[PDB]
């Protein structure tokens, strides 16, 4: 750190993540989480005794500091390819595992039992310490640096060695892959040096258009090899994309599914925290003993208000980091899908014939919109693909546990959200229909004034400006009526977007008191439901757009597949300059 203040080699240095870099961080974050649980239990138990009992949590409090440094120390040994310092790290995992296990087995001798939380967490720590120990040993197996005579050194990847690569997201520590920490330097640089193509450097190998195009062709080539299908239809393309980009699309879904589940921890923590505060009796406390240390149990651990707030804080960090990582994985795949499809479309442009039956039908405008409109709506579909797999899950899980929170009246009120959603699909559809009317009319007026602004000298020396301007105004009035309809539908869209959740709560709570009257609507139950409605409104009132994009994407692939199997320039695969003997030329593929 003192040298880093005056270190210039780290200005553009390269790295090499050791074998097990991902399994190290995922264990460390799990280990950090459980060490917080031990702290919470330790401070929970000692509150009943007259003494501090510092041995309950300070050993765990020192572990949390040691665990954090163990990954800071490991990272500094990862950036500088000097694995020899991992011996100190290796000793720590060997030593911590042995000492903790002795504690764990001694709990069983005194018959602590799993019914005590400290026995569970200590047992868990043995597994986490053991697994982290195996990670360090696996480094020696692949790097071979301590004992083996010939170390199998590893060099930084070739794409990283380029000075012209500045999007270092694919190769950074797992914490920076989640928090996007590497962007900090680029963002700060944007304040002083404006961002041009100089700052945005060459993209990495994984995201290069040529690299993606190779994978798409391999997906097509393997499809035509494993399966012998003559046509290349919409299903042929759909199966092609999944092969070439499924292994990343599933990762985006996995993050979204977990972030969706972790999102409901908020309402459960809100329900848990307030319910404990809805009880007048705070003199009561966890009370069970084995030696006099007063081990706390599971249910008593999740009854303390402060415990749930801390667990909520940990859960929120995971949810809001998985959710953001879900977006990036979905987006990066979408950008690569666009990159590998623009190349495929352009590669089809070279290999297509120039027949008047072919090129006289699909003008340049037809193929230009294919790249702009047809590809983007397909590209945007891969952005929202995780939603349609998970938004049903998030809504169902939302509905399942919203039934338990308040009862039936919540489902009756939430039905209004579900029942009015199909109308919102109609509003959005009617919004677009009015949008195309303006879009087609704006182009007509803009094309009309383009002639006006092109011959202005003849339109100004002949005093025709007053006459020609009136044509623009009249065309504008026919344009502005369409825009007024669009403005109406987008105004109604906002109303249904924001007034339905208020209507859902209004129906839910009044209906609960009047029709049901099954409870007093305590803040534990009422305010837990308010969070659930906020969490459910966002997927409920945006799932219409996911469906609409999927409908549009089906057209785009259908349109793309029709274009991709058009006439081609034959005889490509198969003395005087102009040597023609027979020369029975033609334009129709067969005959004529």
């Amino acid at each position: 750190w003192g040298s880093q203040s005056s270190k210039v080699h780290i200005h553009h240095s390269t790295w090499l993540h050791f074998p097990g870099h991902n399994l190290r961080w995922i264990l460390t974050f799990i280990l950090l989480f459980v060490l917080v649980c031990e702290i919470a239990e330790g401070i929970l138990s000692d509150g009943v005794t007259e003494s501090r009992h510092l041995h309950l949590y300070m050993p765990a409090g020192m572990a949390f500091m040691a665990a954090i440094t163990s990954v800071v120390y490991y990272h500094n040994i990862e950036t500088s390819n000097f694995p020899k310092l991992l011996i100190a790290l290796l000793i720590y995992w060997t030593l911590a595992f042995i000492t903790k296990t002795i504690k764990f087995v001694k709990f069983y001798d005194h018959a602590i039992g799993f019914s005590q939380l400290r026995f569970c967490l200590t047992g868990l720590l043995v597994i986490l310490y053991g697994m982290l120990l195996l990670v360090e040993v696996n480094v020696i197996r692949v790097r071979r640096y301590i004992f083996f005579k010939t170390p199998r050194e590893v060099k930084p990847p070739e794409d990283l060695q380029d000075l012209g690569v500045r999007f270092l997201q694919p190769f950074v520590n797992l914490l920076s892959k989640g928090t996007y920490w590497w962007m900090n330097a680029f963002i700060k640089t944007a304040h002083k040096k404006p961002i041009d193509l100089r700052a945005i450097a060459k993209l990495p190998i994984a995201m290069r258009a040529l690299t993606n195009y190779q994978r798409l062709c391999v997906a097509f080539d393997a499809q035509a090899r494993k399966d012998t299908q003559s046509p290349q239809g919409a299903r042929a393309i759909w199966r092609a994309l999944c092969h070439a980009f499924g292994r990343r699309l599933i990762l985006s879904s996995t993050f979204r599914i977990l972030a969706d589940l972790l999102g409901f921890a908020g309402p459960l923590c809100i329900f848990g925290i307030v319910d404990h505060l809805g009880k007048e009796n705070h003199v009561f406390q966890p009370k069970t003993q084995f030696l006099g240390v007063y081990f706390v149990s599971s249910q008593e651990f999740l009854g303390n208000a402060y415990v749930l707030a801390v667990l909520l804080f940990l859960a929120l960090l995971l949810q809001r980091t998985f959710l953001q990582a879900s977006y990036y994985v979905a987006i990066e795949t979408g950008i690569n899908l666009r990159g590998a499809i623009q190349t495929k479309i352009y590669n089809k442009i070279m290999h297509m014939s120039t027949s008047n039956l072919s090129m006289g039908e699909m003008t340049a405008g037809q193929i230009c919109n294919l790249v702009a409109i047809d590809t983007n709506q397909l590209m945007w579909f891969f952005f929202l693909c995780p939603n349609l797999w998970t938004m049903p899950v998030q809504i169902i899980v939302g509905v399942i546990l919203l039934y338990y929170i308040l009862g039936v009246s919540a489902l009756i009120g939430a039905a209004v959200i579900i029942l009015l959603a199909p109308v919102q699909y109609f509003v959005a559809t009617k919004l677009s229909q009015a949008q195309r009317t303006t879009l087609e009319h704006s182009n007509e007026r803009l094309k009309q004034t383009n002639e006006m602004l092109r011959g202005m000298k003849l339109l100004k020396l002949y005093a025709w400006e007053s006459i020609f301007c009136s044509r623009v105004e009249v065309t504008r009035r026919k344009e502005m009526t369409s825009l007024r309809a669009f403005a109406v539908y987008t105004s109604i869209s906002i109303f249904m977007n924001t007034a339905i959740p208020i209507a859902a709560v209004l129906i839910t709570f009044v209906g609960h008191v009047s029709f049901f009257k099954e409870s007093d609507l305590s803040p534990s139950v009422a305010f837990a439901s308010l969070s659930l409605f906020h969490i459910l409104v966002t997927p409920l009132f945006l799932l219409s757009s996911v469906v609409r994009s999927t409908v549009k994407a089906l057209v785009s692939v259908q349109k793309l597949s029709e274009f991709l199997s058009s006439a081609e320039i034959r005889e490509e695969q198969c003395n005087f300059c102009v040597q023609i003997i027979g020369g029975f030329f033609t334009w129709t593929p067969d005959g004529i």
């Binding site: 258009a209 804080f313 929120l316 990036y328 950008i335 803040p523």
Partner: protein
């Protein structure tokens, strides 16, 4: 955009006011937290404008390149220059993608940072609200509003 911009900043004002009222100890830490929020809201706009300008100005040559290839397809195949034009496309497409990838990262950089700040608010608000519900006797009513 104006309707959603006002609703976004008013909901933040509405939320912050209620959290401050439920737990007056929160606004003691809000000022140190708001300053960090300002700098995140400061550097982002400088980069976001530049990236979005780079986002648009990089895709205009791409669509024109497609249009001109369709216009003069016969000439390009005649010169046997399709090898170079495909290489131009990869240079045109890669510039378009890398401009968009940085734009996405900037949005993701903002969204992660502006949600750890929100997470730090939740812990601070929950901690003070629970304590003020044990000593000042908030009676768990405003505590729920302080959380939702």
């Amino acid at each position: 955009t104006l309707e959603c911009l006002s609703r976004s900043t008013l909901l933040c004002v509405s939320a912050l006011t209620v959290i401050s009222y439920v737990t007056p100890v929160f606004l003691v830490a809000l000022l140190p937290l708001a300053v960090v929020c300002y700098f995140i809201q400061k550097y982002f706009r400088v980069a976001s404008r530049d990236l979005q300008q780079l986002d648009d100005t990089t895709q205009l040559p791409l669509v024109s390149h497609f249009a001109e290839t369709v216009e003069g397809l016969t000439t390009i195949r005649a010169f046997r220059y399709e090898a170079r034009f495909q290489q131009k496309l990869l240079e045109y497409t890669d510039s378009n993608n890398i401009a968009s990838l940085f734009l996405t990262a900037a949005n993701r950089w903002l969204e992660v940072c502006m949600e750890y700040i929100g997470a730090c608010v939740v812990l601070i608000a929950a901690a003070t609200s629970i304590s003020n519900s044990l000593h000042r006797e908030l009676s768990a009513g405003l505590v729920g509003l302080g959380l939702t």
